[PDB]
Amino acid sequence: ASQDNVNIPDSTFKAYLNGLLGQSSTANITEAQMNSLTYITLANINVTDLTGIEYAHNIKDLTINNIHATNYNPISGLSNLERLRIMGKDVTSDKIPNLSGLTSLTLLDISHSAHDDSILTKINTLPKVNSIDLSYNGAITDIMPLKTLPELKSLNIQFDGVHDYRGIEDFPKLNQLYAFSQ
Amino acid sequence: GLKASQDNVNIPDSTFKAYLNGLLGQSSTANITEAQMNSLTYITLANINVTDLTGIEYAHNIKDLTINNIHATNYNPISGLSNLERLRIMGKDVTSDKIPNLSGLTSLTLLDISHSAHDDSILTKINTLPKVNSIDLSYNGAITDIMPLKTLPELKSLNIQFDGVHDYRGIEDFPKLNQLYAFSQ
């Protein structure tokens, strides 16, 4: 199946990927080509559907800002990701899948979004995550479930809705906290 | 009582005495009575050289004491200002040995000792203030421990931005903390 073309129904996303591959914007892309990529960065471009990204088995960095995707479900199997950034005023917690499969992830940034407390049980089993940025999510009020993260050292909750700090003592490796009320 | 109110106050620092005389409408070197010190509501000493605050212990009615960059030898004379509500002392030379134990500041609701050179020795000097509800310890790189502050019964707001705190165990024991400002290196 390595030579099979990949369905990338979003033309803007497909144009971006073709650019990385030195191809014209509407050219077809094989599974092998997707497997050759190491980073994807989508910042302030309109990408509504990330279908196709599940074939990018080797990307180590995925950086997304204000792309207005319907959801981010196709990232759930990207087991080689090390650094994941997803931001956007329209990114509510339903849009992000459970991330337990991101077994290489060391950095998670989901700042400047519209997350609520439900995001915490999607991100609290990441085995290697070292830093989490949850800042500028005003509806996040309870970060106690993050105590289950074995390697978390840095946590940013600036400008969230957190006003109860009980539980932070249960974080095994936390040594850098960024906090700012209101 | 009535006699004592007319007694002159020893204020050996001439810069401080001149400042106080300004507030009182007197010439810069005029003598100042105990009653006159008790008539003050605010004292702000900013970017003037005041080595010694002796005399300030008579300012029983001041509600705010604001001190920035005065290079005092120490701040001992403030220790008994039990009616003081807001205290700010800042300066790059202000180490914790220069601030007296503040447990006698029974009315204090606001403490700001930011932008200074404090270390963990300050903690036992400020952790039993009975009414303090906000403390700003920011920009003191040598403050590394917040645990002793759990003994403050009314503390709601704590600012430790740009300190040296890397261990947050004990924060769960603060009875009223509901606003935290924190930022590492």
For residues A166 and A143, the answer to whether their CB atoms sit within 8 Å is no
Q: Residue A48 carries which DSSP code?
A: S
| Residues contacting B34, CB < 8 A, separation 6+ | B4, B5, B6, B7, B9, B58
Judge: A174–B183 Cβ closer than 8 Å, yes or no. Answer: no
Pairwise CA distance, residues A30 & A36, whole Å: 10
The rounded distance, in Å, linking the Cα atoms of A67 and A71 is 10
Report yes or no: A84 and A62 within 8 Å, Cβ to Cβ.
yes
Chain-chain contact of B184 with A177 (C-beta, under 8 angstroms): yes
Alpha-carbon distance B29 to B15, whole Å?
Answer: 9
Question: Is A84 exposed, middle or buried, given 0-12, 13-18 or 19+ CB atoms closer than 10 A?
Answer: buried
- Integer-rounded Cα Rg, in Å, for chain A is 17
E-assigned strand segments in A70-175: 83-87, 107-109, 131-133, 154-156
Cβ neighbours for B81, distance < 8 A, ≥ 6 positions apart: B56, B57, B59, B60, B62, B65, B104, B105
Q: Do B179 and A168 touch (CB under 8 A)?
A: no
What residues contact A30, with CB distance under 8 A and at least 6 apart?
A2, A3, A4, A5, A6
Domain B1-185 superfamily per CATH = Ribonuclease Inhibitor (3.80.10.10)
Answer whether A165 sits within 8 Å of B181, measured CB to CB: no
Give the resolution in Å: 1.5
Does domain A1-182 fall under CATH 3.30.70.1450? My reply is no
Contact A85, A109 (CB under 8 A): yes
CA–CA gap between residue A166 and residue A131 (Å, rounded): 20
Q: Do B166 and A175 touch (CB under 8 A)?
A: yes
- Interface residue B174 vs chain A (CB under 8 A): yes
Helix (H, G, I), strand (E, B) or coil at B172: helix
> DSSP strand E in chain B: where?
42-46, 64-68, 86-90, 110-112, 134-136, 157-159, 179-182
> For chain B, which residues make up each domain, given as ranges?
1-185
**Solving technique for this entry?**
X-ray
Q: Say whether residue A163 is in contact with chain B using an 8 A CB cutoff.
A: yes
Q: Between chain A and chain B, how many beta carbons pairs sit less than 8 Å apart?
A: 48
CB atoms within 10 A of CB A143: 22
User: Under 8 Å CB-to-CB from B3, ≥6 apart: which residues?
Assistant: none
Give me the residue from A163, A167, A178 closest to B172, CB to CB: A167
How far apart (Å, rounded) are the C-alpha atoms in residues B155 and B149?
A: 8
